[PDB]
From a paper:
In this work we report on the [name] encoded dissimilatory ATP sulfurylase from the sulfur-oxidizing purple sulfur bacterium [name]. The genes cysDN (Alvin_2448 and Alvin_2449) encode for ATPS in an unusual sulfate assimilation pathway and the gene [name] ([name]) for an ATPS involved in the dissimilatory sulfur oxidation pathway, respectively. We produced the purple bacterial [name]-encoded ATP sulfurylase as a recombinant protein in E. coli, determined crucial kinetic parameters and obtained a crystal structure in an open state with a ligand-free active site.
No significant differences were detectable between them except for a rigid-body movement of the C-terminal relative to the other domains in the range of 4 Å and of segment 233∶239 which contacts the C-terminal domain. The N-terminal domain I (residues 1–172) is basically built up of a β barrel with five antiparallel strands surrounded by α-helices, the catalytic domain II (residues 173–331) of a typical Rossmann-like α/β structure and the small C-terminal domain III (residues 332–396) of a small three-strand β-sheet and two α-helices. The structure of ATPS of [name] was determined without any ligand in the active site. Two MES (2N-morpholino-ethansulfonic acid) molecules (present in the crystallization solution) could be, however, identified close to the monomer-monomer interface far away from the active site. The catalytic process starts by binding APS into the empty active site groove best expressed by the [name] ATPS structure present in an open form. The conserved GxxKxxD loop after strand 9 (224∶230) is in an “up” position and highly mobile in the open [name] and “Candidatus E. persephone” ATPS. The open form of the C-terminal domain of ATPS of [name] interferes with the pyrophosphate binding site which is created upon APS binding in the closed form in front of the N-terminal side of helix 12 (361∶370). First, in [name] ATPS the GxxKxxD loop is in direct contact to the partner monomer.
Residue numbers in the entry:
A (entry chain A), B (entry chain B): 1 to 396
The structure:
């Protein structure tokens, strides 16, 4: 198995021993407590689930400044983004060395983690601006990741945490949410030696299906982990049950036996483009993937990043040999009339534009909503049917 | 895939649509509510998870009486034990049609399910005694299943349920708890056509490892699902994560690639021997297993059942055609020095006790405590090492 990043074994922060879990849960009900931001809560779930191994909790300001500017902690460990717990005020936990962190995204704000607080620090305007410009590559308040980061308050609490649950990501998505620990176990047992990871939050049509297959053939992979971003439903997104049925139907009918793992994780998007792509590679190595697909404008928003910056950041900016996972560099696909299959256009230089047929993800979605199956070059009939049945069911 | 029992597809009671799940959770806080028994909570978890498919909720008295005496509901569907929600009284919910069921096993007694109450019935002494003697094979109050059944009150509430979570089973055991739905999907991903199910709660030593391999060879299985009963700890128990690590090490080193799934489910044991064996077969068919291992004194307690009664029940009490799943009829196993392999006892009646390598449970745990591995005919060195590491690790 590919090694975890920075250690020989994953070091998750979830309390796996049930007796210790029960004792901590009991203790937490009498501790001073704070409700954290959704960003900090996601950071805690990722730490609990082993995705951010081998880190122990939330960063002090020196580690956060070092991570933002250089992708390292002060002690030299590689980690690509700051992991901060920022609050409007630390008054409720003044002088406390042990506190409960409560979940902002579950009714009644239950305890998510217990934290040993080793520092409480105020972040200056200059420190915030430095971290913002370095992580997000802009100072524009129109950038949604910039706005969230700067909307949490300026008191940073730092120290190691013990995670008691995985929030609504597990409760709402019980069949798909997986820890990095369990994805690594499952890769191991299924016998896969090379494994491609692919992120999505919506149904996969033929273009994305074929991109996974191209990547698998190129690197001689034994399997693909489809790693779905779980979270609250965004306007125009496909509800989870329908999305899951579409992905699982594609996997069962169009891939060979024992080649697909359908899984998911919970973490708020940063919209940080090339910097977020490094974070993605980091946690995918932790879960056991050997290859990670990065296409055009990966993790991007607006016009802040160049189309392939998230690929090239791995050439220069990421320190040599900190990561063992390799990038499969994807690009736009089209159906080749000459070859009778979906290809990356860049890899068919013998073709003229007229040799391709193109149909966007937007156009596919429009057709499905009108009850018209897209051409079989772009959508599988059984996947199309699942989506058409969904759109037809709506009162709209 | 083997068909679910009594339908073409599983009909779980969990609310998979997150928006509907959120709406119901919010509604449930304002409903009349009752804290159910641990048995009823377990029933709801199994119903939520698809294991008791195609049932919609708790049974009325007529169905429970039919299930107890003939393993069928009044409409003729096969189901082998009553699923009752018994209460001391309906006072907390008098008159309400829609109610919240609260979990007795989680601090705070959170909502586990929402229920539409379609009947409320008093269970007579005669009705209770008939169900008791039929399900458990005895009316002895000293049988622990009998005692649990008769300690819940006499008001049965019945009607369909919608399940909001899987109680402490998923929270405490996030990498191993699985629904019947997910197990069936993973069996599909892995491409298995014949699948053996084996239940255990403990680490698997060479005797259980080879029992599973015997079963797989006999039926030409592609894989085995190790389906662990998850629950509450008792003093002296090996922690769940150590037990899982021992089973995963065996799976990774001693079984071929893509042959083992390590999973768990949550339910309170009935100790009903042969009747509980029929229930195990039922839910293992629903999870997608084609064969189920039943050894000696399966689900037994006391001296109420014959040592192979849990196998022979399928011959003379279970209607043909109701189950598709097949039983692998096992027995206790041990390593024979005369033969040089693990054997079931019944293929070795000629052996004397000195022809086997056998160690008591106390002997094994105490020698592992001292950093001593059992002989390699009894334990794999790598599995013994997991256990020894736990016993020699700093306590707490």
């Amino acid at each position: 198995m590919i090694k975890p990043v920075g250690s020989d074994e994953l070091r998750p922060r979830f309390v796996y021993d049930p007796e210790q879990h029960h004792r901590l849960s009991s203790e937490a009900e009498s501790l001073p407590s704070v409700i954290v931001s959704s960003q900090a809560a996601g950071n805690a779930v990722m730490l609990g689930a082993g995705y951010f191994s081998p880190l122990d909790g939330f960063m002090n300001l020196a580690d956060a400044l070092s991570s933002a500017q250089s992708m390292t902690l002060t002690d030299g460990r590689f980690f690509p983004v700051p992991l901060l717990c920022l609050l409007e005020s630390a008054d409720a936990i003044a002088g406390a060395t042990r506190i409960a962190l409560r979940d902002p995204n579950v009714e009644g704000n239950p305890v998510l983690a217990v934290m040993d607080v080793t520092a409480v620090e105020q972040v200056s305007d200059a420190q915030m601006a430095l971290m913002t410009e370095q992580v997000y590559g802009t100072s524009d308040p129109k950038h949604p990741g910039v706005e969230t980061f700067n909307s949490q308050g300026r008191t940073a609490i730092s120290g190691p945490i013990q995670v008691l649950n995985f929030s609504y990501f597990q409760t709402d998505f019980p069949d798909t949410f997986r820890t990095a620990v369990e994805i690594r176990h499952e890769i191991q047992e299924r016998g896969w030696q090379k494994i491609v990871a692919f992120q999505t939050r919506n149904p996969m049509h033929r273009a994305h299906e074929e991109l996974c297959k191209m990547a698998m053939e190129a690197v001689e992979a034994d399997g693909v982990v489809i790693h779905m971003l779980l979270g609250q439903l965004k306007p125009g997104d496909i509800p989870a049950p329908v999305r899951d049925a579409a992905i699982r139907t594609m996997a069962e009918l169009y891939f060979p036996p024992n080649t697909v793992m359908v899984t998911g994780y919970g973490f708020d998007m940063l919209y940080a483009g090339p910097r977020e792509a490094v974070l993605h590679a980091y946690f995918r190595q932790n879960m056991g993937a050997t290859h990670f697909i990065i296409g055009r404008d990966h993790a991007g928003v607006g016009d802040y990043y160049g189309p392939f910056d998230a690929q090239t950041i791995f050439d220069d900016a990421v320190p040599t040999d900190v990561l063992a996972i390799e990038i499969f560099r994807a690009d736009n696909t089209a159906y080749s009339k000459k070859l009778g299959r979906v290809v990356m256009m860049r890899d068919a230089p013998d073709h003229t534009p007229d040799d391709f047929i193109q149909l966007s993800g937007t156009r596919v979605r429009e057709m499905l909503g009108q009850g018209e199956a897209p051409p079989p070059e772009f959508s599988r009939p059984e996947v199309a049917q699942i989506l058409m049945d969904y759109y037809r069911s709506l009162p709209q």
